[PDB]
Structure 1
Amino acid sequence: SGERREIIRRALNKKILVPNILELMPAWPSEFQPNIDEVNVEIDEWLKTVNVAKEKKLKHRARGNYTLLAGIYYPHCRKEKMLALSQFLYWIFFWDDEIDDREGTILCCAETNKCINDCLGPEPNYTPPPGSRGTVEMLYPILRDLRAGLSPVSTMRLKQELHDYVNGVKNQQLPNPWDHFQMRVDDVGVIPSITQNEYAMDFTLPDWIRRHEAMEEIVLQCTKLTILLNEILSLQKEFRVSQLENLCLLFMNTYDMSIEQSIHKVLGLLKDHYKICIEAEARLPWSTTDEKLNNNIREYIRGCQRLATGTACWSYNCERYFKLSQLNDQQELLLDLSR
């Protein structure tokens, strides 16, 4: 932790201009669900019922505005689907925030995993146990509404992915950068939002295509790309609260890279994984005859891409990570690791 102090020292008050990450994924457009505004109104009415601190809810609604993120993740869904999808993102940010006490983390993950089993398992019960904490209580109806619009095929995936997320977060309690990177792969809750594209677009991907090596690769690359652009876009926010386990800082620590080189290395990894992913599209088992099947493969991988581009584009349109003033007229971001 002299280790800590030296990272803090080597990056304090550094200012780093970041190129528009969207440009690094040039073939993948960002779009906006056209009913975001009417959904936020309903999301606003709904949040009044959520047993979370009004001031915590508003900070998330104002600076996070996760309905806008859902609208970028699922820009082509119908508005009726937007409600549950948005509700889901408020849950995962409230829950993730409520964690960031070993005893209390263990207890909360156990209750959350139980909620997931109770809602998405084979003997469903959508009634929260009495005394449930607010971030667990709210999840019960949200998983129920999502389950109502998924096939059991997609349901089963969302169940595992959520469990994986929860258990991942329970298991986070200076790491080698590659160690940090890989556990974020088998943790971060991007893959639940790939599966929720099935809910949004009212289709199911057959397991046999999902297990195909190109499809798995595409999911892994878009998960990796989401993590990588998030490592850069969140460096300011986490450095200021001395969350020093950020891939950039960890490249600084392990390899004695400058922060500039470190960010630059992350930007190259992005470019690498973006081309790996594009190449995987050629190896997908596209059908010669089945249009609907091929329309299902297309929407699925569009959800994968939109998760990387959407995470970036949303971050460029909300204040969760930096103040939007920090963007120049080229969507370039001046990080300011001042404190």
Structure 2
Amino acid sequence: TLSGERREIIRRALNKKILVPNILELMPAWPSEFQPNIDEVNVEIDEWLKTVNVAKEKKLKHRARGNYTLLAGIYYPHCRKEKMLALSQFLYWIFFWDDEIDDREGTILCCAETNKCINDCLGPEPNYTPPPGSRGTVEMLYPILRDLRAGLSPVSTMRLKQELHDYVNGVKNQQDHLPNPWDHFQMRVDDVGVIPSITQNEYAMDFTLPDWIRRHEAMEEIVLQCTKLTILLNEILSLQKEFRVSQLENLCLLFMNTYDMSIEQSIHKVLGLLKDHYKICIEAEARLPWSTTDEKLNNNIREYIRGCQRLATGTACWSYNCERYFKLSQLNDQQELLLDLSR
């Protein structure tokens, strides 16, 4: 039965302490940087948060523990200051949205109102006014999508539209055995909401990758590998948080269930998977359609793949610099995380 399978996992992982190596070391060629105006933008974000129709205590818990302006600052360390507000706001949207919707009918209603908002704002007849009904996490999305679209070409807008629809519908669609690990991992590859952040590098850096390059197999592979990398490192980094509220559909635990690995072996398996996909990602760059003549085009290709890589390294770097997933005291002097599956 479900309970039996979930029972044994809780028993097998409970109170386990697992020291995790510094994940950024597994991606050595990809550096972590910080946008230089994070503090100043956070002042603006704090004032803006006062008007978001989310509960004060909830907005402050997100700001205090997740501090998504910092995540935007690591994803987009070289953007100009004026781009940082909309990037940070979007990240507060997606984490607030995910939180409120984390009841079948409520999820169905909100997803449809959110898809409506996405179409309203990014589609062929733009309407940025929220309907009078709108719940807080939908009402706040209209000005965010409007501001992003103002800095995007219609080519990038179409990609952001489809990527946001994919994320929304992945959440709606996900509602006797724990799931198979590959099934879970592949589900997160399809549904995880990292791809709108790759596209927002085009807002952040004020460029458009041509679609013929975006559809090239090497670019498609770099986007995919970086999506897989972000997910994999998140499986490890979020394990303590997820296990503490007994959300056992965590890749590490699914490896424990399906293959009877220890929690130590399972985490080591995910780390191996990160090394494989990083090496695959690195190989794809030589296959990209680099121009022999066009400096601007090659700077755009460069920037776009750096956006992809910073999603992987930046997600890690941010997790090591906030308390969304663990207490920062759990990191030692060389940034090894001591997971604690106590509860």
TM band (smaller chain): over 0.9
Deviation at 1:147, TM superposition (A): 0.2
Deviation at 1:171, TM superposition (A): 1.2
Deviation at 1:271, TM superposition (A): 0.2
Deviation at 1:181, TM superposition (A): 0.3
Deviation at 1:112, TM superposition (A): 0.3
Deviation at 1:326, TM superposition (A): 0.2
- CA offset digits 1:276-334 (Å, max 9, x no partner): 00000010000000010000000000000000000000000000000000000010000
- CA offset digits 1:163-214 (Å, max 9, x no partner): 0000001111111000000110111111100000000000000000000000
Deviation at 1:99, TM superposition (A): 1.1
- CA offset digits 1:106-133 (Å, max 9, x no partner): 0000000000000000000000000200
Task: Give runs of aligned pairs for residues 70-85 of structure 1, distance below 5 A.
Answer: 70-85=72-87
Matched residues in 2 for 1:16 and 1:214: separation?
Answer: 36
- CA offset digits 1:252-280 (Å, max 9, x no partner): 00010100000000000000000000000
Deviation at 1:26, TM superposition (A): 0.4
- Structure 1: runs of 5 or more not aligned: none
- CA offset digits 1:218-271 (Å, max 9, x no partner): 000000000000000000000000000000000000010100000000000000
Matched residues in 2 for 1:96 and 1:307: separation?
Answer: 19
Paired residue for 2:329, among 312, 325, 328? Answer: 325
Deviation at 1:44, TM superposition (A): 0.4
Matched residues in 2 for 1:171 and 1:5: separation?
Answer: 26
Paired residue for 2:243, among 230, 239, 245? Answer: 239
Deviation at 1:96, TM superposition (A): 0.5
Matched residues in 2 for 1:214 and 1:74: separation?
Answer: 22
Q: Secondary structure at the match of 1:160?
A: helix
- CA offset digits 1:66-102 (Å, max 9, x no partner): 0000000000000000000000000000001111100
Q: Secondary structure at the match of 1:156?
A: helix
Deviation at 1:134, TM superposition (A): 0.1
Percent identity between the two aligned chains: 100
User: Structure 1 segments of 4 or more deviating over 4 A?
Assistant: none
Q: Secondary structure at the match of 1:16?
A: strand
Matched residues in 1 for 2:76 and 2:320: separation?
Answer: 17
- CA offset digits 1:14-48 (Å, max 9, x no partner): 00000000000000000000000000000000000
Matched residues in 2 for 1:104 and 1:175: separation?
Answer: 25
Matched residues in 2 for 1:24 and 1:165: separation?
Answer: 28
1:305 aligned onto 2:309: yes
Q: Secondary structure at the match of 2:270?
A: helix
RMSD value, Cα? 0.4
Q: Secondary structure at the match of 1:186?
A: helix
Matched residues in 2 for 1:140 and 1:256: separation?
Answer: 47
Task: Give runs of aligned pairs for residues 156-305 of structure 1, distance below 5 A.
Answer: 156-173=158-175, 174-305=178-309
Q: Secondary structure at the match of 1:76?
A: coil
Paired residue for 1:136, among 135, 138, 157? Answer: 138
Matched residues in 2 for 1:77 and 1:229: separation?
Answer: 25
Number of matched pairs: 339
Matched residues in 2 for 1:332 and 1:170: separation?
Answer: 36
Q: Secondary structure at the match of 2:119?
A: helix
Q: Secondary structure at the match of 1:17?
A: strand
